[PDB]
Every structure is written in structure tokens, then in C-alpha cells.
Amino acid sequence: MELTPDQQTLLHFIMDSYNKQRMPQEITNKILKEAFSAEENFLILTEMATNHVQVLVEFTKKLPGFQTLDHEDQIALLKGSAVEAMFLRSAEIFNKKLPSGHSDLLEARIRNSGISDEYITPMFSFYKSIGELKMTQEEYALLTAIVILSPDRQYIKDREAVEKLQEPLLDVLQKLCKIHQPENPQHFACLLGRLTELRTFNHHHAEMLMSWRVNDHKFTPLLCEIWD
């Protein structure tokens, strides 16, 4: 029927942190103005990818309990969720935030950046599949928090501490499905489908970086350090 005052408080903190994301004006202006070349298109995308890492960290820091975790486990969670959080935020932006005209130029830039179809095809396939679910802002925010507070990421020393933060988010998300979609009992199951679909992007992304060499304009030293 309704969220408990404690669940409402937890949801508000995640919503507030999630709603802080705002695509910078200089990035939006570049999508419109810059030359339509593989080199210029790839540079725009690298800047967007780098900007997402800063957005992710700032969002994560405000997640209830994140700051209470061991410092090395905070790093491990950020590193283990970076790719997954990026594709999820990208799916939200592509289906909601960006206007039809600029989304079209951004899609044109992505499709003409030098990146292989082996990575572009599952990317847009996932955006369409996310779009079908007509996710609310509470659902995107909670799914993002769930993705980041994953207890099974590599190099986590205290997994029980992370499970204690992830379990109440899964409880709130399932409750929100029961309140807002009481006619569709499979709504929560569809959202879980996106968690497993997002996991497939870790491999796709790792291979994409491997395809990049020093001789090519695609070599991104900073991003390659954050992604391993």
C-alpha cells in the first residue's frame, strides 16, 4: 500500500542524489557544433564517458551508508559498477532527457566514431529494451544504487557490509512495483532482467578497449586506468 517513513527517507536520499546529474552546456554545444568526423565524434564520446565517472562518484558518495564502508571497498564498488552504471544512465538519457534532434546527432556521432558494430548493436538494443519498460525516475535511481551496491564485485573485503546496504533498496524497489504496477506482478521481474542484461556490458566494454591501440586516435590513457 505505502512505503514506511524509513523507506521514504531512504528513497528521498537516493532520488535527491540522482537528480543532481545535469549534462554540461559545453558537451551539448559540441554535439551540435563539432565536425562530423570519426576523430571529432570519438573525442566527444570520450569526454562524455569521463564526465560520467565524475557523476557516478558524486552520486555514489551520497548513497545512504556508502561512506560507512571500508575505503578500499568503496573503490572496488566504484570500479566494479562503472561500466554498468554508465550504460544505465545512458539508457535513461537516450529515452528521456535529450531532445529528439540532439539525440539524433548524438546517435549519428556514436554510429560514426570508429567503434565496431559488435559494441554499438547491443548498446542500442539495451536502450530500446529499457525504453519498453517506461521506467520512472524512482526506478532508474534505485536500479543505479542497486548496481553500485553489488556485494559480489571483485576485491570486496567485507561483502556482508555491502549486502546490508543493497537489501533495503531491493525491498523498496519491489514495494514500488506493487504500489504503482498492481496489475502487472511481473514488473519487478522485468527490472531484474535489466540487472543481468547490464552485466553483459562488462565483457563488451573490456573487448572494446582491447581493440584500441596507441597508433590509433581511439587510445584513451585516463579511461583505460579506470577500466580493468
Binding site: 565517472v53 562518484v57 558518495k61 573503490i75 566504484l78 586506468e225 579506470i226
Partner: peptide, 12 residues
């Protein structure tokens, strides 16, 4: 190692 993530996490 993890110098950028560390800096961003341990700032403001």
C-alpha cells in the same frame, strides 16, 4: 593505483 577514483571519492 586507482589514483583518479581515490581523488574524486576523497574530496568535497
Amino acid at each position: 593505483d586507482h589514483q583518479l577514483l581515490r581523488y574524486l571519492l576523497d574530496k568535497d
